[PDB]
Write a protein that binds this ligand. Structure first.
Ligand SMILES: [Cl-]
Ligand code: NA
Lengths: 128, 5
């Protein structure tokens, strides 16, 4: 009878193995065991991005933010969802918030957040 | 960033 934490770890292993629907299902099993852990939802949202299920990813990001309003990954994945759904102004806001939160939390993701920001601004402009 | 936690 795997625990929530155990299922999260199994889902992580499937994700690295590129088994994205299987990983998403595993994170769902984790949520069943403990639905109050934001990371399970942001992990599943990442899977949904890999699966082109943007609306499903967005909903998971919203669940995560209800449980951890400071989640860098929740804001970043939300912005990535909104970018693919052509909501550029919201995408920029969420990616900027991810940047600020990562700075506040002393997290170093290299140029990954600035890079995404330039896409959303570039795409916002190219749409204009 | 692009990996699960
Ligand atoms: Cl990947
Ligand atoms: Na996509």
């Amino acid at each position: 009878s795997p625990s929530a934490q155990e299922l999260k770890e199994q889902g992580n292993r499937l994700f690295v193995g590129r088994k994205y629907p299987e990983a998403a299902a595993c994170y769902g099993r984790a949520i069943t065991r403990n639905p109050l852990v934001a990371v399970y939802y942001t992990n599943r949202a990442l899977c949904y991005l890999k699966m082109q299920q943007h609306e499903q990813a967005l909903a998971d990001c919203r669940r995560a933010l209800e449980l951890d309003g400071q989640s860098v990954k929740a804001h970043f994945f939300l912005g990535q969802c909104q970018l693919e759904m052509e909501s550029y102004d919201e995408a920029i806001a969420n990616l900027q918030r991810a940047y600020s939160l990562a700075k506040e939390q002393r997290l170093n993701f290299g140029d990954d957040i600035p890079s995404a920001l330039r896409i959303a601004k570039k795409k916002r402009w190219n749409s204009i | 960033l692009w990996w699960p936690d």
